[PDB]
Amino acid sequence: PQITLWKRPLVTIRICGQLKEALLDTGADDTVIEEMNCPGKWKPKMIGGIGGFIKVRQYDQIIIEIAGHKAIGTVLVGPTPVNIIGRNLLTQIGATLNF
Amino acid sequence: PQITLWKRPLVTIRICGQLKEALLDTGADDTVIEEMNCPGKWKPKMIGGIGGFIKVRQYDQIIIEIAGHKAIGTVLVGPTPVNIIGRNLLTQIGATLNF
Numbered sequence A, B: 001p002q003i004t005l006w007k008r009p010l011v012t013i014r015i016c017g018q019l020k021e022a023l024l025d026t027g028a029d030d031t032v033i034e035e036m037n038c039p040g041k042w043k044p045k046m047i048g049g050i051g052g053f054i055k056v057r058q059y060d061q062i063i064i065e066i067a068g069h070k071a072i073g074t075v076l077v078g079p080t081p082v083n084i085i086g087r088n089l090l091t092q093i094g095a096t097l098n099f
């Protein structure tokens, strides 16, 4: 599909058996998902943005379906205000920026 | 161009006569540029991102060239980690996400 940018580019995702809305985010290196009590091994990470850093849990090889497109990779879980699909999974679903 | 997302979507911008590097950021509502001298009046605003809120100077109707494409609109100037071109200007240069 083609997504214009008049509004936030939000899509439905499925992760850890849950449906969520998430932002397709070309400005995020990594994918960050709002706090959820998920299983699996993880490593502590800190990620920085506008305002400073938040502490997150890094899970590897997490399967996510993004707008019907399957992806598998690193998902960071923590107190983000919005669910963010970053470049690590955008590349896997064939997403480009065009102008 | 069509821009794939294996690398950060960094482009050269010209703002207030100065060349800068900026990130094309579909997850940003607003364009936020690092502290710099900008001519004219501005108003104090705050904006929030992943780590909390910062104070910025809002400059309106700023002419900015983005990867060779002209925009004129709002630029927030403040202590952002990265120069970000947000949707308020991505829409002006005809940028869409595609997959």
Ligand SMILES: CC(C)CN(C[C@@H](O)[C@H](Cc1ccccc1)NC(=O)O[C@H]1CO[C@H]2OCC[C@H]21)S(=O)(=O)c1ccc(N)cc1
Binding pocket: A025, A027, A028, A029, A030, A031, A032, A047, A048, A049, A050, A081, A082, A084, A086, B023, B025, B026, B027, B028, B029, B030, B031, B032, B047, B048, B049, B050, B051, B081, B082, B084, B086
């Ligand atoms: C600042 C960017 C270089 C990086 N970020 C992605 C960015 O797209 C966030 C994504 C975002 C969006 C909303 C809330 C938090 C983070 N947007 C953002 O800070 O935009 C601000 C400027 O315009 C406003 O519109 C939305 C918030 C404001 S980030 O959220 O901090 C970020 C940093 C690291 C990773 N792995 C993932 C995301």
